Subunit: 358 residues, 4 copies
């Protein structure tokens, strides 16, 4: 702990800039602002999510509005440097991965275990709560998960790994199931790696972008890729079922949040199929209602995660998923605008951009 | 068996008229067309569903198209009059309730028990398969369910009772759950009666029609009714949550198939809530995507039923549900156009119209 | 707050006696021992559970051992008299019902919502944690549930109501299901009332005790009672299926914890049936393994509850369950040995004995 | 079709011998006994299951009693040689894998999809229904699953593969779950291969037999093996949890049917753990009731399968599971007693013994 704490900010005007941030260095060196059960973590690595890019470029997601200077990022791991005297769970020096989510333990979504839906949740990347794109953060120990000697880029990947896992779990994917992934951005790709490790088969992944498809095929040889053309939902699903052999997918994990892609997924899945939407987009979309109806197709949606962390860790420690392999670009904190620019331009060839504090 | 077999037909031109129908009387008197495992049933009573009215008035549902002279109706009970020699299960003289659905027993939806999604299904009211608005029908015994001394109007109610039950089951309604019903037409009303017998509470039912709301309150005193005004989905859900006390529903059973009503339901239910759509409407609707997303709201849809019959029977025999109480109008077969006219004009005061063959 | 705090104690020697208890009066009058988020409740009413009787008479349940002077009782409601300054949720004067369970919010069973399995749980009636058979208790606010103007005997019934609900929920009981209840002690009876409100049918309840059967039939007219005779499991299940009509139960809610009763339940339920054991008994029992096997019968077990409280409250407020009707005996705190004696002798005619502090 | 039809028989006296069998050659050459929807299959390969060995050596399983000359075997694939004119699904020359199970399509377990529990089921290896250890069998087409150019030993493995899959599915195994397998006989081994392909981790398998453990480790390098010593259930579970790291298994797939092994599994699994018993043994076993109780441990049991076939096929075609690798011994039909002797003596080094008709 020697450097001044800076952070990566955006505003309603859609600027992105670095600036000084809390806690202050001095604060952390003497453990001033450190509350009950809290620690200070030196953030070593942080992935840029579609989340962040959308907040930067647009200022909102749904009810989530950037109303003033706001620090981004929520996919992070780092080193514990200060510890409140109460903190039993964790010690100075520990590599940890940060679950960007603080829970009240008292509302219904908390007590029934669906704690991503907590009624008083602080979700770190989400306005007004400051993100993790800073050099130091104060965070409750119970949300800093020990990772032993795991690399920091892996530890940071634990968060979108968790998005994939929570999706998978609520989607109900099982060994033998034919699974469709729509979108080969970071989340699609991790979700595909996940389906594959889960024994899904056959596996198909779609995208508008050939390059991201060739990447998907390199990191998961057994998948069948499908480049999407301008077609009605109905017609797109035929193509898709062709890519599967002639088998209709049991589950579509939708990772674009885009109208046409969700429609084709509704047309593509089997009778009693599940279309699970991880992606995020417009406030309102047009849905093919009657196709969903006559097919008993379940439409499901994800809002972050819960109870994925110990399991995400296990998958990485046992080599069941290979995450680090998805980070194409690495930028130091100070160069964050370079990071966001490349993370937003697909011509870049970027998949997962990491911002680091070594 | 003395009268000529007539039926109630519609066409792409949206006519509704009575006309001669198969099997012929003589055919049934000597058991000509009677295949393996089949019986002939003298249809005693048949309810008019929204289904039928929509086929008559519009010629389709989704992929379901009336392309020529087609016999309607699928909510029926009646008396067995002829029996193939193989038929073990059922005897001449038996009151039966007819499950309007013939299964291939060989496709995946059949073998996994989701047999409403059979790939070669004959669903009797559905083109091209002739409905049950006839005097006699030939039907496999395994789809004629014994009802002992139950009334025929009850026996006929067994089918929309079944729609309610299959909804309830897949929606996951349980004792103690707060449940919203949208629409107080026949299906809403049966679904409300069902939720109530299931210990749902509190119970709210919406409609645009005050009269159908006052009826709902008469047949289910403990329900809270809610008349819908022209409001944004968001604002409508606030009203709805007000009608609940301040509790947000766990499950919305949507029985109108209408866009605005489905939207408000998405806004109304709790975090991790389920909006279950029984209703049917437009090929495409606008959905509030981000509200669904941030709330982890499951959108589900129903396509008929399976394995509801023995259970629907139990509920009626034990007095747990009171169905006959919903039939407001009774018409003889010959007067079917009167029946459909009244079943389609809400000013009629009709709830469930039955067409009979005494 | 005027009286000295006494409590109801047992020991390894199987004595039961009243004695002074913590917190002390003075402690509560000035709010000494009151920690963060805690309140002091004046316990108004407390039911004696089979739990308590077994601890008194035997000194253990499974791994739960009375090793020294221990305060019993965990089915309680009462009045809030002192409040830590932090406590937001609750105010002095509030009637509350006490969930006898303190959670760490950090272990896996806690975060996934199965918080009855918390790895560091304080369960109040359970050694070494002091029960609720005292005049005052200090308890976290988040486990004191507001009950407005509900009676204290109802508020106290909320706990075994909760045992029934958690059973029901994990057993998977639904509207239309035929349900067997084994045992007509307090828990059986509440579970029966629950099944009934849940639209279970038909309902059968067994017991060795005719009097408790006649009581069951009085409070739930529609149930069929079954007196158990000395018979093989197989033969007992035939009798049981006879009591059902000829329908085999979908679910057996077993509330005796006794070997022969569990066996007959395994024989009684349908193919793919669930036998759910609420009852507690011997460390080891003999099971009919092959019957379970060839029938795909799920054996399930309950350990208390979670997330039943707001729902238990709703059922009582809406008149869906009538609990107070089960309390046959009422004793003041000081007369607790009379209470336990009568609660343990079935010749008493007791169902639910309450101990009160008016 | 040239050879006389012989079969492998056992009797109540526990003899095993080969003898002439139905249908007769001539019968098959002219398609005499061929009913509606039926085909004749020339059985090419058939695995010996624990089932068969137990029927041979003991004469029963539970209610399943060998009462006279009975043909064994139910794990088979072979070639279609005759086809009833109705048979659409399948053609002469097709390699098929035989699902040893004929369904009535009319009882409740059939229509709800749990069709392994059919009330009028013919299960081929099970008395009185003749097994598949014959040269020709007549079987309904809908239970002969096309396998294209798959090997016959794989096609035959499809049946115990199916036992594993149905277990897995009802046990609820998912990606990331720590899974315990008890027993390294054929079923354990396939179940382990299955868990592994399902992304289970860590994986532990137990056995009394070191050789079968070394085999397990060869075919699944990433598994941790555990040799069982004579210890209390409690103490055995500690050892087991040690083999896992210190993580407690989510699911125990029990494949021995033995009392002590099931007990340790009950002690071993986590809170809310599932112990799923595939194995079969004594009519009655002693259970550790209180451990199950305080842990909310679900005990589940399997009776064969349903809807595993298309999925078992997919797993083999995509190389997700490697079955053929488990067949250690291959015997021609005529040498069946050699086959059963070796399949019953573990000193043999046998895992899966196949009996063939080339
Ligand atoms: N719900 C959550 O909790 C959660 C968590 C993480 C990410 N997300 C969301 O998941 C989405 C994807 O995340 P990402 O980081 O991979 O973003 P990304 O932009 O890198 O990936 C989106 C991909 O979708 C592809 N795409 C666009 N239109 C398509 C179409 N019509 N068909 C097929 N593919 C199409 C793009 O080419 C791109 O590769 C984002 O909207 C993000 O906000 C949600
Ligand atoms: N999915 C299935 O298998 C299945 C089975 C039976 C019926 N249905 C469908 O269920 C729907 C209802 O059936 P029904 O027989 O009761 O028809 P119905 O017209 O009698 O009932 C529809 C009700 O919706 C009310 N309504 C219209 N707009 C509304 C709004 N904005 N908010 C609240 N209420 C509104 C109407 O006033 C009417 O009372 C139909 O569309 C029918 O086809 C589906
Ligand atoms: N698992 C939990 O979290 C939990 C919570 C509450 C109560 N319980 C347990 O539930 C059980 C019942 O509680 P209770 O308060 O009603 O006790 P209780 O003794 O009042 O009820 C037991 C009943 O079982 C009857 N019975 C005994 N043998 C029988 C047999 N062979 N067949 C049928 N009935 C038989 C008795 O006559 C008695 O009526 C107790 O063992 C108690 O510890 C468990
Ligand atoms: N339920 C079904 O539908 C179904 C289907 C197939 C097989 N099975 C049953 O599964 C069981 C296993 O089948 P299999 O063909 O592998 O038989 P098998 O005898 O080859 O395997 C049993 C294994 O259990 C091991 N074992 C014995 N005692 C043990 C203990 N105390 N701890 C750990 N391991 C122990 C043995 O060494 C042996 O390797 C049989 O009982 C069989 O009948 C059931
Ligand atoms: Zn993200
Ligand atoms: Zn909360
Ligand atoms: Zn209808
Ligand atoms: Zn079918
Ligand atoms: Zn109790
Ligand atoms: Zn805990
Ligand atoms: Zn077998
Ligand atoms: Zn059957």
């Amino acid at each position: 702990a020697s450097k001044t704490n800076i952070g990566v900010f955006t505003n309603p005007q859609h600027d992105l800039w670095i600036s000084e941030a809390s806690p202050s260095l001095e604060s952390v060196q003497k453990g001033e602002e450190l509350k009950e059960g809290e620690v200070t973590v030196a953030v070593r690595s942080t992935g840029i999510c579609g989340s962040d890019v959308h907040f930067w470029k647009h200022g909102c997601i749904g009810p989530m509005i950037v109303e003033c200077d706001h620090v981004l990022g929520h996919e992070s791991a780092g080193e514990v440097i200060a510890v409140h005297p109460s903190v039993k769970s964790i010690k100075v020096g520990d590599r940890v991965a940060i679950e960007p989510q603080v829970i009240c333990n008292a509302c219904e979504p908390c007590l029934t275990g669906r704690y991503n839906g907590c009624e008083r949740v602080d979700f770190l990347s989400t306005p007004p709560v400051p993100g993790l794109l800073r050099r130091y953060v104060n965070h409750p120990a119970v949300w800093c998960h020990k990772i032993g000697n795991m690399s920091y880029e892996n530890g940071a990947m634990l968060e979108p790994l968790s998005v994939a896992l929570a999706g998978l779990q609520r989607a109900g994917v099982r060994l033998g199931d034919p699974v469709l992934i729509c979108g080969a951005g970071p989340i699609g790709l991790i979700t595909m790696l996940c389906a594959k490790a889960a024994g899904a088969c056959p596996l198909v992944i779609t995208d508008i972008d050939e390059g991201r498809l060739k990447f998907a095929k390199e990191i998961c040889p057994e998948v069948v890729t499908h480049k999407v053309e301008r077609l009605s939902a109905e017609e797109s699903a035929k193509k898709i079922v062709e890519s599967f052999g002639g088998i209709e997918p049991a589950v579509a994990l939708e990772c674009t949040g885009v109208e046409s892609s969700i429609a084709a997924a509704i047309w593509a899945v089997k009778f009693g199929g599940k279309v699970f939407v991880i992606g995020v987009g417009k406030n309102e979309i047009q849905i093919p209602f009657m196709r969903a109806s006559v097919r008993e197709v379940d439409l499901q949606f994800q809002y972050r995660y819960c109870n994925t962390w110990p399991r995400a860790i296990r998958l990485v420690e046992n080599g069941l998923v290979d995450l680090t392999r998805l980070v194409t670009h690495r930028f130091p904190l100070e160069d964050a605008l370079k990071a966001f620019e490349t993370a937003s331009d697909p011509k870049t060839g970027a998949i997962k951009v990491q911002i680091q504090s070594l």
